Design a protein around this ligand. Structure first.
Ligand SMILES: O=S(=O)(O)c1cc(S(=O)(=O)O)c2c(/N=N/c3ccccc3)c(O)ccc2c1
Ligand SMILES: O=S(=O)(O)c1cc(S(=O)(=O)O)c2c(/N=N/c3ccccc3)c(O)ccc2c1
Lengths: 6, 6, 6, 6
């Protein structure tokens, strides 16, 4: 599970 | 920018 | 720019 | 597997 906010 | 992967 | 999901 | 390059 990957979650990435940029 | 948002990236989700599962 | 490279993105690779395997 | 995840690969990122920039
Ligand atoms: O699924 S395949 O067998 O088709 C496969 C497998 C890999 S690999 O096993 O992750 O090695 C790569 C790969 N490697 N890319 C990395 C670069 C830097 C760090 C880690 C990995 C690459 O540059 C291009 C194509 C690939 C195809
Ligand atoms: O902070 S950075 O600007 O250096 C940056 C930028 C990106 S990126 O521009 O969104 O490309 C990524 C990234 N990309 N992830 C996607 C995967 C699938 C779809 C869309 C995007 C990733 O997997 C890992 C690290 C990253 C770091």
């Amino acid at each position: 599970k990957l979650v990435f906010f940029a």
